[PDB]
Amino acid sequence: FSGLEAAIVLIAFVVVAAVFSYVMLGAGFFATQKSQEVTYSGMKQATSNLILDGM
Amino acid sequence: QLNPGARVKVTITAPTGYKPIAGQKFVLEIKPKTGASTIVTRTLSDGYNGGVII
Numbered sequence: 001f002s003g004l005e006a007a008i009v010l011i012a013f014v015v016v017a018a019v020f021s022y023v024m025l026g027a028g029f030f031a032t033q034k035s036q037e038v039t040y041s042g043m044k045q046a047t048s049n050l051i052l053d054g055m
Numbered sequence: 056q057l058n059p060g061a062r063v064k065v066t067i068t069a070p071t072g073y074k075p076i077a078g079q080k081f082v083l084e085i086k087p088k089t090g091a092s093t094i095v096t097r098t099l100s101d102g103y104n105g106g107v108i109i
Binding site: 053054055 | 082084086092094
């Protein structure tokens with residue numbers, strides 16, 4: 001049994017990690033960038049209120 | 056401008072058609088930007104050669 005083949009796999013473990021890492025970050029930024037949008041809209045929802053002024 | 060706790064003499068001239076005559080009520084809504092808007096309704100007593108509006 002040789003670690004030469006272990007290397008072959010170790011790539012695969014690392015690569016799928018990096019890809020998941022890659023996407024999760026992308027998934028994550030979008031998560032964040034979405035989380036920001038709802039917040040901006042959220043404040044804009046309340047503060048965009050319009051009012052009847054006087055009689 | 057008015058510093059808070061100060062006053063000014065405002066002088067209104069009513070437009071050609073809207074000049075009220077004795078016995079006719081008028082309303083004046085005062086609308087400061089960003090603030091509660093007043094209204095002052097008066098009716099000239101039928102009388103009133105002029106002067107103070109009681």
